[PDB]
């Protein structure tokens with residue numbers, strides 16, 4: 001729906017702390 | 022860089038939710 005939206009990664013800070021746990 | 026900064030612990034709430042799993 002958003003006119004002009006762009007693709008980028010969004011960093012989830014939880015994911016690596018689960019990955020290291 | 023901060024004039025007058027003080028040392029204290031900062032509680033991360035996710036760390037114990039991992040540690041208690």
Ligand SMILES: *[C@@H]1O[C@H](CO)[C@@H](O[C@@H]2O[C@H](CO)[C@@H](O)[C@H](O)[C@H]2NC(C)=O)[C@H](O)[C@H]1NC(C)=O
Nearest residue numbers: 001002003004005006007008009010011012015
């Ligand atoms: C942003 O990402 C989406 C998803 O990868 C891209 O959408 C695809 O575009 C191609 C054509 O270039 C289509 O054949 C695919 O079917 C599309 N995927 C989906 C899920 O619809 C989109 O093109 C990307 N935007 C830019 C500017 O690169």
Ligand SMILES: *[C@@H]1O[C@H](CO)[C@@H](O[C@@H]2O[C@H](CO)[C@@H](O)[C@H](O)[C@H]2NC(C)=O)[C@H](O)[C@H]1NC(C)=O
Nearest residue numbers: 022023024025026027028029030031032033036
């Ligand atoms: C806040 O903590 C830092 C350490 O994290 C203290 O810095 C040390 O200070 C001593 C002298 O008191 C130096 O010999 C060390 O080299 C310092 N450590 C580092 C890593 O630079 C700092 O003094 C503390 N602040 C207060 C007001 O106690």
Ligand SMILES: *[C@@H]1O[C@H](CO)[C@@H](O)[C@H](O)[C@H]1NC(C)=O
Nearest residue numbers: 001002003004005006007008
């Ligand atoms: C800016 O203009 C281009 C065409 O010149 C258009 O394809 C694009 O969607 C527009 N971007 C935004 C953010 O409106």
Ligand SMILES: *[C@@H]1O[C@H](CO)[C@@H](O)[C@H](O)[C@H]1NC(C)=O
Nearest residue numbers: 022023024025026027028029
């Ligand atoms: C207040 O003054 C003391 C010295 O009297 C100094 O060490 C400290 O950095 C100062 N704190 C601030 C917030 O300016």
